[PDB]
């Protein structure tokens, strides 16, 4: 059940409804070999 949350957050649309609202970054996990969860973040410029 926690894996369902993690999976729907990594591929689906979670957190509902929007994301990325943390100082123009984004941190999304990445699970592998069934026994770890690693992280990899995004960034952006000051457009608009």
């Amino acid at each position: 059940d926690i894996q369902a949350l993690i999976a729907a957050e990594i591929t689906g649309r979670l957190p509902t409804p929007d994301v990325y609202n943390d100082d123009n970054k984004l941190v999304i996990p990445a699970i592998n070999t069934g026994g770890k969860i690693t992280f990899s973040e995004l960034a952006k410029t000051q457009s608009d």
Binding site: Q3, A4, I6, A7, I10, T11, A30, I31, N32, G34, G35
Partner: protein, 879 residues
Amino acid sequence: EALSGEYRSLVMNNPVADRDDIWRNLLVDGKVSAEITTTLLADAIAGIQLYINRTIAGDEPGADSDALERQFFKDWDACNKRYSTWAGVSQLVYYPENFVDPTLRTGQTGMMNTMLEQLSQSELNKDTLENGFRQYLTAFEQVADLKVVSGYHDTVNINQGNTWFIGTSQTEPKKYYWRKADHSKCQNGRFAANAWSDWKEITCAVNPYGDMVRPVIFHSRLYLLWIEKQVQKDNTGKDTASFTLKLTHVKYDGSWASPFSYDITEKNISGWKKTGLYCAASQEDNSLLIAWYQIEKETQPNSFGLHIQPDMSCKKEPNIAGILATVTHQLDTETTVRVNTLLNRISSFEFTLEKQEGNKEIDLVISHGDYTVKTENSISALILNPTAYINITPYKLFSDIPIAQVKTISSDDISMEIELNSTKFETITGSDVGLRPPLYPTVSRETLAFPFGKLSITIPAGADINNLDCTIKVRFKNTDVLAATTTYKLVIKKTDPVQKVISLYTTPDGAQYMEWDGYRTRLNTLFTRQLIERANNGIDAILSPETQYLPEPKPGQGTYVTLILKPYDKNTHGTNRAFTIYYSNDATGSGKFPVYSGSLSVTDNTEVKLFIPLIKPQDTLYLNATYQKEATKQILLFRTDNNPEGWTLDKSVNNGTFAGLAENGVTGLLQSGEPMDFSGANALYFWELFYYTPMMVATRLLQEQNFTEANRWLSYIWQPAASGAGDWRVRPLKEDTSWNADPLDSVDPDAVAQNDPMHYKVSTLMKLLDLLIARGDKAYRMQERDTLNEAKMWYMQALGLLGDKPVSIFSNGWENPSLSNAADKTQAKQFHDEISRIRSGGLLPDVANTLTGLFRPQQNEKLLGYWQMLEMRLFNLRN
């Protein structure tokens, strides 16, 4: 309905078409009601299945017949037609334990059959459970005591074909049995354990004289053959002795025919002493050459022959001392026993595949079915195969009736014209066959066949038979408009493969072995001479691992050698990680025999142990190795005395190292005895006795709910160890011993699990899980308090056995590929190519991402059933 009408009116351009033609043309049913719901993959599957059925039943003309003649479609209806049976068959390579039934197994011996018969009642108390095992053990002892009397090798090259053996029992009267050793499962002088058949009894009453029994394969059928001596008395006081040759064979139902008999006594075999008989089939003039000959130090001072036609009629061979003269390497002597092979052809035929082919559109290749030479003429059987595919220009292309060519009758179109030394003789098929292969089935790439009936081609005359008998060529011509010719050359030449001898021995301490070209194969086992003392302590002592480590005399004269080798170094081993180690005698240039092949390890010493036989009769022996780089230098192994285990460690001036072992570890040179073999000739009997019998009795007590005894019988196989891992009490499981080299030639789980006994480990643990869950359920239905605690105990034990539930990843590297990107041929070729590279150890892996290609391996749904059952029962217990 409206869309379908307009579809076939506009797109299909055939408004009168039925609406089912939309179904057949578009692979979707439109006449369904609005409630029939299916997934989308399932609809694609149903569509492609309908398509494959219609194209395999001919309703979709123009299919690739070559593709339809392919294993996937050949196994279409049986396996691949429905998802159910496709999945069930595909899982059988990976989870055979799901389908292994411990009671019913293919190739189950008659002993195990009769034991299962006697355990098939409901009252299995210790008395019946021990009587059954004592009876099984009596039968096992009898089939283990069999000593091989004589053999006969099927083909003429002793590296191919089968070797039939005749074994006798250590009783009185003797009972004769027969096996078969398939040499097509024999690399490096090492028979796969499944290259051997079961010992099967000869029910006829065979009462040989002086141990003269011979198997022989006459028209693919096993014949037995022995000489029977019977004491008589003349009318006068003199008391003679009459001899009879007896001959029988297996019928199709495995019974033995009533033996024919031929009176043999003619004034001379009565006079011999220590005679022996010979028997071999003939590739020319299908008959049986039988021959009894006198034995001395040398073979055959005198010998009488006999020929037998398939009507089983005597025809005395008048001059056989000349025929036995060529095969004297297969004949017995006063001290050796040699198996016979079939008779060589006097003249070996060879067919150059082509000289010229003419029109390079029709392949027009022939194939000489049978070929031989009679007393004066060479007969042959020929079949001719053209292409006859699409693009015969111009087109119509409506109908084929079976400016352009002949679409009509194809009479006398093909013809063979053999060219003799100076002459030629031209036969056309209009003179042979009334059957004509029609150009219809016009559908493309269908090839045809033109069979010729036993062309007794006359006549080779004025030619030296057979010294300069190489006829120039054999040429034929599919003469037709736009059609061609090809020609073949007949290269008959008299040959003589000499002294390829294959013999049987028996060491003074009991061991037998068949010694062929440069190897030795142990035939019998001395296990029963030592089991006899264990057997008085009971089943617990018969089935304990100390019984399975019992030693065995070494086959003949030779040494065991335990070669230890260094890990893979790219410099000394070349690029490929595989290695094969040879031995020789060695008159360097006398040929060396590959005695072991393997994949040399990385970051670890690999230890290969062998038995190097002494066949040459300072007994020299020279071991090599062969890598991708080059073949290393020999290593002398010799001895000074006649010690049987004495073979000099670290022989003379040579360095004593290949440069691949480069350590002080070579020796293993003592130990006149090796352990009992679980992948040799008698592998089946040992595996039955030590694994398949306890598993059968345990699964047979689990059913009928004898849990405290089912556990006792499983604890003959596996028993939990105080350390982490379990204690496997079956030797070939403890040291994973593959004993089925070719397991995918049949849809059976036991072959796979024999090829990889880790599946027998998993099957055993699954039976144990069954047992624990059943004890838990039994105690859980007696609903009182202490029994509920006991049930929770049994379930907790099963959980501890299973371990930790494997978490199922869903955020995985599985993208969502399209069907076309998932069904590529490059996708399968790359996968299998990398596997075949990493399997021959071409180099180390890439380091290590993908093992099974695009689709991931699945967890055993049976194990998940165990997990779920335990969680459910434990939930109900806790609540």
